[PDB]
Design an enzyme around this catalytic site. Structure first.
Site, PDB file in Angstrom:
ATOM      1  N   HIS A  69       0.928  -0.974  -0.621  1.00 29.83           N
ATOM      2  CA  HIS A  69       0.125  -0.074   0.093  1.00 29.83           C
ATOM      3  C   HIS A  69       0.861   1.121  -0.159  1.00 29.83           C
ATOM      4  O   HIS A  69       0.845   1.744   0.960  1.00 29.83           O
ATOM      5  CB  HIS A  69      -0.836  -0.014   1.333  1.00 29.83           C
ATOM      6  N   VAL A  75       2.587   3.968   2.258  1.00 27.85           N
ATOM      7  CA  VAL A  75       2.206   4.700   2.871  1.00 27.85           C
ATOM      8  C   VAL A  75       0.562   3.676   3.930  1.00 27.85           C
ATOM      9  O   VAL A  75       0.587   3.049   3.563  1.00 27.85           O
ATOM     10  CB  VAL A  75       0.569   6.251   2.522  1.00 27.85           C
ATOM     11  N   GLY A  78      -5.349   5.538   5.039  1.00 28.83           N
ATOM     12  CA  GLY A  78      -5.686   5.624   6.121  1.00 28.83           C
ATOM     13  C   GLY A  78      -7.039   5.611   6.214  1.00 28.83           C
ATOM     14  O   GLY A  78      -6.766   5.572   7.782  1.00 28.83           O
ATOM     15  N   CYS A  79      -7.342   4.184   6.432  1.00 26.97           N
ATOM     16  CA  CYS A  79      -8.649   3.534   7.078  1.00 26.97           C
ATOM     17  C   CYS A  79      -8.219   2.597   8.619  1.00 26.97           C
ATOM     18  O   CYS A  79      -8.873   2.518   8.833  1.00 26.97           O
ATOM     19  CB  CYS A  79      -9.214   2.092   6.015  1.00 26.97           C
ATOM     20  N   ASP A  83      -9.350   3.414  12.045  1.00 25.78           N
ATOM     21  CA  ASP A  83      -9.593   2.562  12.567  1.00 25.78           C
ATOM     22  C   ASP A  83      -9.511   2.725  13.967  1.00 25.78           C
ATOM     23  O   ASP A  83     -10.164   1.672  14.645  1.00 25.78           O
ATOM     24  CB  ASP A  83      -9.998   1.009  12.089  1.00 25.78           C
TER      25      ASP A  83
HETATM   26  O1  U0W Z   1      -5.167   5.316   2.893  1.00 29.47           O
HETATM   27  C1  U0W Z   1      -4.909   6.332   1.519  1.00 29.47           C
HETATM   28  O2  U0W Z   1      -5.300   6.941   0.168  1.00 29.47           O
HETATM   29  C2  U0W Z   1      -4.372   7.472   2.422  1.00 29.47           C
HETATM   30  C3  U0W Z   1      -3.264   7.417   3.842  1.00 29.47           C
HETATM   31  C4  U0W Z   1      -3.508   8.639   3.975  1.00 29.47           C
HETATM   32  C5  U0W Z   1      -3.864   9.447   2.926  1.00 29.47           C
HETATM   33  C6  U0W Z   1      -3.732  10.795   2.689  1.00 29.47           C
HETATM   34  O3  U0W Z   1      -2.423  11.334   1.905  1.00 29.47           O
HETATM   35  C7  U0W Z   1      -2.434  12.594   1.578  1.00 29.47           C
HETATM   36  C8  U0W Z   1      -3.175  13.641   2.560  1.00 29.47           C
HETATM   37  C9  U0W Z   1      -2.208  14.987   1.817  1.00 29.47           C
HETATM   38  C10 U0W Z   1      -1.340  15.072   1.672  1.00 29.47           C
HETATM   39  C11 U0W Z   1      -0.467  14.359   0.973  1.00 29.47           C
HETATM   40  C12 U0W Z   1      -1.139  13.273   1.448  1.00 29.47           C
HETATM   41  C13 U0W Z   1       1.159  14.910   0.820  1.00 29.47           C
HETATM   42  C14 U0W Z   1       0.744  16.010   0.135  1.00 29.47           C
HETATM   43  C15 U0W Z   1      -0.887  15.934   1.215  1.00 29.47           C
HETATM   44  O4  U0W Z   1      -4.690   8.997   2.673  1.00 29.47           O
HETATM   45  O1  U0W Z   2     -15.167  -3.319  12.429  1.00 29.20           O
HETATM   46  C1  U0W Z   2     -15.764  -2.968  12.869  1.00 29.20           C
HETATM   47  O2  U0W Z   2     -16.007  -3.075  13.723  1.00 29.20           O
HETATM   48  C2  U0W Z   2     -16.663  -3.146  12.371  1.00 29.20           C
HETATM   49  C3  U0W Z   2     -17.779  -4.175  11.046  1.00 29.20           C
HETATM   50  C4  U0W Z   2     -19.230  -3.368  11.046  1.00 29.20           C
HETATM   51  C5  U0W Z   2     -19.494  -3.421  11.364  1.00 29.20           C
HETATM   52  C6  U0W Z   2     -21.305  -3.175  12.267  1.00 29.20           C
HETATM   53  O3  U0W Z   2     -21.439  -3.945  12.721  1.00 29.20           O
HETATM   54  C7  U0W Z   2     -22.400  -4.130  13.124  1.00 29.20           C
HETATM   55  C8  U0W Z   2     -23.498  -3.397  12.943  1.00 29.20           C
HETATM   56  C9  U0W Z   2     -25.164  -3.440  13.183  1.00 29.20           C
HETATM   57  C10 U0W Z   2     -25.556  -4.173  13.565  1.00 29.20           C
HETATM   58  C11 U0W Z   2     -24.744  -5.463  13.757  1.00 29.20           C
HETATM   59  C12 U0W Z   2     -23.519  -4.674  12.998  1.00 29.20           C
HETATM   60  C13 U0W Z   2     -25.146  -6.942  14.233  1.00 29.20           C
HETATM   61  C14 U0W Z   2     -26.896  -6.252  14.950  1.00 29.20           C
HETATM   62  C15 U0W Z   2     -27.405  -4.709  13.966  1.00 29.20           C
HETATM   63  O4  U0W Z   2     -18.312  -2.623  12.625  1.00 29.20           O
END
Ligand code: U0W
Ligand code: U0W
Lengths: 167, 167
Positions: A69, A75, A78-79, A83
């Site tokens: 990634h 990098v 972001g997710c 998390d």
């Molecule tokens: O998983 C991703 O797509 C992810 C992680 C972090 C980001 C944000 O990326 C950025 C966001 C803003 C800026 C840069 C990079 C460099 C110039 C300014 O995106």
């Molecule tokens: O990564 C997580 O925390 C994650 C993945 C998906 C969710 C949402 O979980 C839910 C959200 C709503 C409901 C259930 C589970 C079962 C009862 C209804 O949370």
């Protein structure tokens, strides 16, 4: 409520269900665990008077997510920083003594305005608990790398499920 | 713009930089890749007349994220389904022929109201492109498991960087 800081070994114990007990809030185990330590947790203070978490993740170039990634453009996803903030709000609900399994329910606005490169040393998470209300917590959060704020999230929501029968 | 569907082998080629070229939008490689196939991509139609993506991820009980998330309570991380939607908006920008490296810039409201269990067969992503404007795309997205909508995201944003000098 008596313990206000947690080591990596405390968090791994949490991931096995041995900190808050079986059927209660669990951190993920590696490789989904996005926290090394909880530096501070309290149910008072923070931005809204309802408590706060400060947590850290150490960065080194060998962390699994850098190689895939992206290839030739490493990098931290972001997710995964987002998390970590859900992981910490879930930890807070468990730490308060609430029963049930943790799920992220979503967020209001998320902004990514910087990045974690394999040359970074440390990511810090700041969580401000807004409200506790199933049992759920609403929080605002920031992700910072080596002192620089790079992500913000408003209205992070995490709930605990004791029963999913009716859903 | 001529190719309207992509196989897993096309997406792996994209992850090596060999679909849109080096320095251009790349999908992650495994284990961050959260798409098996793009069933449909177009720059016309969809909810706003600005095009649409439909993509799929096959589910089986052995996918890496089930064992660590969580121990004794397997559930696909919400953050990875959200990341699939950022991965697809980035793919769209690359597919249109725009140069530069993809980054998620965030989202408006994200809601998780269901879950992907290891008994599920297939996750489907629906992306509706709202606006293209650095070059960035704004989109709405849903995640569905075996026909049931479980996540929604409004205002997903992804940008392409040709130069980060000034940031
Ligand atoms: O998983 C991703 O797509 C992810 C992680 C972090 C980001 C944000 O990326 C950025 C966001 C803003 C800026 C840069 C990079 C460099 C110039 C300014 O995106
Ligand atoms: O990564 C997580 O925390 C994650 C993945 C998906 C969710 C949402 O979980 C839910 C959200 C709503 C409901 C259930 C589970 C079962 C009862 C209804 O949370």
């Amino acid at each position: 409520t008596k313990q206000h800081a947690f080591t990596r070994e405390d968090l791994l114990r949490c991931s096995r269900g041995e900190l808050f007990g079986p059927g209660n809030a669990q951190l993920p185990a590696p490789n989904m665990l996005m926290i090394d330590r909880i530096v501070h947790i309290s149910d008072v203070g923070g931005k809204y008077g309802k408590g706060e978490l400060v947590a850290e993740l150490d960065i080194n170039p060998d962390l699994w997510f850098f190689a895939c990634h992206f290839e030739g453009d490493p990098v931290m996803p972001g997710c995964l920083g987002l998390d970590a903030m859900w992981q910490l709000v879930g930890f807070y609900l468990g730490w308060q003594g609430n029963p049930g399994r943790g799920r992220a329910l979503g967020s209001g606005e998320v902004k990514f305005f910087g990045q974690v490169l394999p040359t970074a040393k440390k990511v810090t998470y700041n969580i401000h608990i807004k409200r506790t209300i199933l049992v759920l917590a609403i929080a605002d959060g920031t992700v910072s790398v080596d002192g620089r704020e790079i992500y913000s999230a408003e209205g992070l929501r995490v709930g605990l499920f004791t029963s999913t029968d009716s859903f």
